[PDB]
Amino acid sequence: MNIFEMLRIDEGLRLKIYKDTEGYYTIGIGHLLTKSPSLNCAKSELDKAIGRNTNGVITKDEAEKLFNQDVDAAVRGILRNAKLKPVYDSLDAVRRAALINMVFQMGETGVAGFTNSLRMLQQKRWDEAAVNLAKSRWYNQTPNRAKRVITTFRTGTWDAYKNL
């Protein structure tokens, strides 16, 4: 297991524009195109992301290219963020993956708002952090995925993604 395999499980792979859990047009492995309710807009965003006039359909290689960019972007977003970087630096590589997962899903600003959880993670109070992480819109709206990420922070293992 690693952050790519982890997010491929949590995000899936779809080659045609689809709406994500929040109703927003997305493609590939969780690549958000736009919050606009316009499908033509989503397609315009898609075409400029991949560099060609798509029909709203991409290949697996193109999906993977966007996904690599998006994972890289989440990591660099963590390392540029004054609240997230010290927590990231303090973690082991498995828990680091859990933090990248969260930023991938909700963005740097949303994760940086989890001030209590981030303090408990930095303190390595893992069970307390797991309890606080669940007290969130995040958990309530995507509870199975949040449980997997939370189990990763609690245990520092990949047990929630084993067999998946």
Ligand SMILES: *SCC1=CC(C)(C)N(O)C1(C)C
């Ligand atoms: S992506 C922005 C956009 C796309 C399109 C559907 C052509 N639009 O009318 C606006 C400019 C909203």
